[model samples]
Target: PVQPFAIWPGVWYVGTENLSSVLLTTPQGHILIDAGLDASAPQIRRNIEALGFRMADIRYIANSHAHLDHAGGIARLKAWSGARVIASHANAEQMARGGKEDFALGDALPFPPVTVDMEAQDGQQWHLGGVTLAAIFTPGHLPGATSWKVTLADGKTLIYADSLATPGYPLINNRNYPTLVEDIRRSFARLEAQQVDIFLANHGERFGLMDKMARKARGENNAFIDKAGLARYVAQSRAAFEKQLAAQRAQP
Candidate 1:
């Protein structure tokens, strides 16, 4: 829904079904957060061109994880533009060796194959012009999944992936109740403790409203879901998960 080349001076979402890649382009060149689905390539390429840059000019390629929806187009873009693919060290091996055909997600579903170029470590600093980002490993969504905190010269934004299930999406589709919620809590807590004035969700319909939602989720009029609350949420969710899993195990 974001107009190409408008330069709104904030976060923007390149809309894709179930998953939208977030991009923050500063004066220092564009940073494409997620590569998106194979279906997203033509639109992505068009957006980039509409934004007055060529596909070859894309400088950074970062992914929240290597899931097909998130990373399906990686190989195509890398082959065409030769961009660097930066991902967590855990998944880096998977990405580097051409991802397994049959992954946990739908038996791999047959998409374009890709291998990563660089292995990113947690707490590592990635700089863009005057902006800086720190990789925070938030596994549970998937092993080696990562979230990026984008720090501007003035403030910061959290580029979160699959942390919170989309408002109406099935939490149980990926995992049981407690596990899904716990991971969401941990990831949210990590971001909440920081100087995050904005949050960019990969599958979010609203790109710029993250800060607003965070605050509103809590009881405070202006308070977002903060660190302590997130930790508590994680605890509660894990407990509930235990209950659910126990019940399932006891089934006849």
Candidate 2:
């Protein structure tokens, strides 16, 4: 039951406590990122409307991954907004088939499938109404897991990060996903290499959305811009992943 509000001049937070949906508004149209659960579609719309944004004005649908918690409502939102769905090539496949074909989770977490109209690659940039967002393929959580870099009007970079948590997935020599460790390792290095000014994640708690929101409400300038926080978060997740890797390696 999070109320949607403007984060930046053209950026709006229109999502729930668990999953975050960010709206990047432009004169051309708007871009909607990560719809929450299937039941959250209407609520996301309600939040968008509350911010004086019309669903039909959304020109493109973007995603960080194909997980049900984030991609669950994409189908409904696509139908309502009539926007083209864009995602990494692999994540696009997962989203199109719902989460049933996921390497680790499989059909254990299925959702309404959404078609991918645009397939993006690493370093690919999408522009609309003078706003440019580059896709960074960070495939640790899933093959299609991605983080987006948005260059703000002031030249600072904002990274809408994808989840790096393993979420109890097997990381060792598992039959389900042989390359899981390799993928995560690459993503961890990639995330650590980025220069981020504003670090936002798919989940609100990952980037301290509540605290920042509270501070913003009370008048704090650049409450969301924390370079040290990004460094700390990346190092923390990387350490956790390595810890799990070490534990799994030593297991009899």
Candidate 3:
């Protein structure tokens, strides 16, 4: 899907197979969501141009979180596009410092630090050329990993979810984040309540994007619109979180 083609009318995928960068085209310019790793920025830029869209046309460079893989290229992308950067408050701090202040994985995976123009509050909505992107705060993967709900005029809802996995973290009695488990569960509930038509993630494979693309190529018109898939994914993420928490609690 990173062939830099439109997934929908105004939504385009512009990152590599491993990472996902979405471009929501608008008459007022464009909104770019998710910039891959540091190494990915240059190629992503080329892909955008390859699709005949100018980098200067990008007005907003929004982030899913400040994790290296997801946010490493934002600084460069914003510089090239002169786009305003939007992120959750905590993640904005992380973005500004290049993950140097990460509570759990401090400085382990740092990148070019960025400046945030807007801090997305939970449920806050913004518009560009008529496409509405709403912030769905889901912090767990990081202290402030924010998910986004991209709603088209036709009422289709797409969730560009934050990384919901714990990866490697102290789930019980952690000094870095005391409310890690609490926040994650609450985030899970928030996601479950959403009416998702298309489920997207920072990592393309998480949503079986390539598989869907393959099927779509074979003439399955609605391969990406899967509400049941989103529901199943949220449950899977919750199970993984709970299992990790259980294992930590069981430890001596």
Candidate 4:
């Protein structure tokens, strides 16, 4: 079981090494970013309770994508917490149908179907108590991939970047690979322009999260704020995508 720890003042990491499920405690209620796998729900519940909060206090649940690893437990979470699920329109449909039409997996891997109560449009703002999050539609990893920009009480911007991993051209729809690469490049550009005080990702390890947390524990005020790391991350991701695209193009 992965131990849950507070990343920010109100944000806690309650997920395992493979998946991410960050919780935001607010005056109104708690907000969860992703749901992880189905089995991860039980631990997630305990993790939230460990923070002196009730599961029923979870008001809203958002996600990075409709992948089973990220959104598999959404249905169970929604039922347990009575939290409204927020997702992009395409992701809403995909989850409601258990990833039946996903760009990469299609119907190969299916999770429990869950309904999305809120559809997130690009630049959509979600306000609950003192927390506000803005959604950015980033569709390279999946059709409904979304990254969130949260403005903390101290005016610092925390950007939760959706998977900036290399595009799976061979595994995903080959016909749309070109457009997919373009979308990924565009997504990187959008994130690059943002004033990100704290940069997190769907996978925490991708951004050297644990190391930063250790530095924070050592009395570093700006340990988690790394604009240079964000720039390097984006540049590295773009380079990987370009390399993969070139190799795929070389194929007959």
- Indicate which candidate wins on lDDT: 2
State which candidate, 2 or 4, has the greater TM-score: 2
- Give RMSD (Å) of candidate 2 vs. truth: 1.2
Cα-based lDDT at residue 181, candidate 1? 44
Worst 10 residues of 2 by lDDT: 224-233
Q: How far is 209's C-alpha from truth in model 3 (Å)? A: 1.1
Off by over 4 Å in 1: 1-10, 97-103, 164-192, 205-252
Ranking by TM-score: 2, 3, 4, 1
The 10-residue segment with the lowest total lDDT in model 3: 1-10
Q: Is candidate 1 or candidate 4 better by TM-score?
A: 4
Q: What is the lDDT of every predicted structure here?
A: 0.59, 0.87, 0.86, 0.82
Report the C-alpha lDDT of model 2 over 1-252, residue by residue, as the tens digit. 788877767888999987899999888999888999898899999999999989999999899999898999999999999999989988888888988878888789899998999998999988888788889998878878998888866677888889889977888767767787898888878887889888888999888999998787788867887776766778889899989888877982
Sort by lDDT, best first: 2, 3, 4, 1
On lDDT, the stronger of 1 and 2 is 2
Task: State the lDDT of candidate 4 residue by residue for 106-203, as single tens digits.
Answer: 68888989999999999999887788888999878876789888887666778888887754546235663446766877888987787887888878
Q: Model 1 reaches what TM-score against the true structure?
A: 0.69
**Candidate 1 colliding pairs:** 95-115, 95-116, 96-116, 214-224, 214-225, 215-223, 215-224
